[PDB]
Design a binder for these strands. Structure first.
Ligand code: NT
Ligand code: MG
Ligand code: MG
Ligand code: MG
Ligand code: MG
Ligand code: MG
Length: 214
DNA sequence: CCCGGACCTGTGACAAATTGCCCTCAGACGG
DNA sequence: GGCCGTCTGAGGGCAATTTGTCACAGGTCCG
């Protein structure tokens, strides 16, 4: 069926802040690179629109604004920091974009690895829920189930959650609860969780999941 | 004992940003 | 050959929802 994205666990666990539309482009770049050094990639408006069910106009809007917002963004591997792009994007032909990814990032893309089909994620809206759905895939078994314990401090550092989510009731209300409900509504995964406490503080969240093909 | 204080939880308000939509008009191409 | 009819996509916008922030109500234990 649809394209199988694979990526090193190091990218899954990196520190960065990207919007939904930017994460969408990033999945296709990883796809192009892996099918091969170069680092020069390309995107056609009319193809983006068909994959994610957008019109050409709104696709054009999404590519263009995503693209100018990469400037100044950095990626951290735990630590080491890199820029995503080393030259501005540019369009040689109408309906075509050309981009220059940092060639030092190549080895981090292809390595202890993570994998999922693109149709699983293309309806998620909140970028933090994409981050969470990836980090769960890293632990999945062939049959489609898994269980993992993530530390709350590590979630805040790695997903670069905004500062007010250090108050636990806001963390619950605006990130944890909402994102477990997108995954349950928009992917083929069925997800549950429970809180681990130490004294008054909640320190970890323990996730279990299965696949709805069983 | 009960105080003020340092922790924790949940909800009500308001501000800022993102969503899918809508309209204009010229570029690229072929009949 | 060259104009025009169509398919694209590069611009300009919108209101309704969602995300980020902080005040206040209401629980416990410490000294
Ligand atoms: C379905 N839908 C989702 C939204 N909004 C969102 O999904 C949305 C809004 C935001 N906002 C933010 O990031 C907030 N950030 C911030 N205040 N600092 C993030 N997302 C993912 C709006 C509507 C919608 O249908 N709007 C159009 C309604 C209409 N005018 N007919
Ligand atoms: Mg959009
Ligand atoms: Mg009293
Ligand atoms: Mg008093
Ligand atoms: Mg009351
Ligand atoms: Mg009180």
């Amino acid at each position: 069926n649809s394209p199988r994205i694979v990526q090193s666990n190091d990218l899954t666990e990196a520190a960065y802040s990207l919007s939904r539309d930017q994460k969408r482009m990033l999945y296709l770049f990883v796809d192009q690179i892996r099918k091969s050094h170069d680092g020069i990639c390309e995107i056609h408006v009319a193809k983006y629109a068909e994959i994610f069910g957008l019109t050409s106009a709104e696709a054009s809007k999404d590519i263009r604004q995503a693209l100018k917002s990469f400037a100044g963004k950095e990626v951290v591997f735990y630590y080491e920091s890199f820029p995503w792009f080393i030259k501005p994007a540019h369009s040689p032909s109408r309906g075509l974009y050309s981009v220059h990814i940092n060639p030092y990032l190549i080895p981090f893309f292809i390595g202890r690895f993570t994998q999922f089909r693109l149709s699983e994620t293309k309806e998620i809206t909140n970028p933090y829920a994409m981050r969470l759905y990836e980090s769960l895939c890293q632990y999945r078994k062939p049959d489609g189930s898994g269980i993992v314990s993530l530390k709350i401090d590590w979630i805040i550092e790695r997903y670069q959650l905004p500062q007010s989510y250090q108050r636990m009731p806001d963390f619950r209300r605006r990130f944890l609860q909402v994102c477990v409900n997108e995954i349950n509504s928009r992917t083929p995964m069925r997800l549950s969780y429970i809180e681990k406490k130490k004294g008054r503080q909640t320190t970890h969240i323990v996730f279990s999941f299965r696949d709805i093909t069983s």
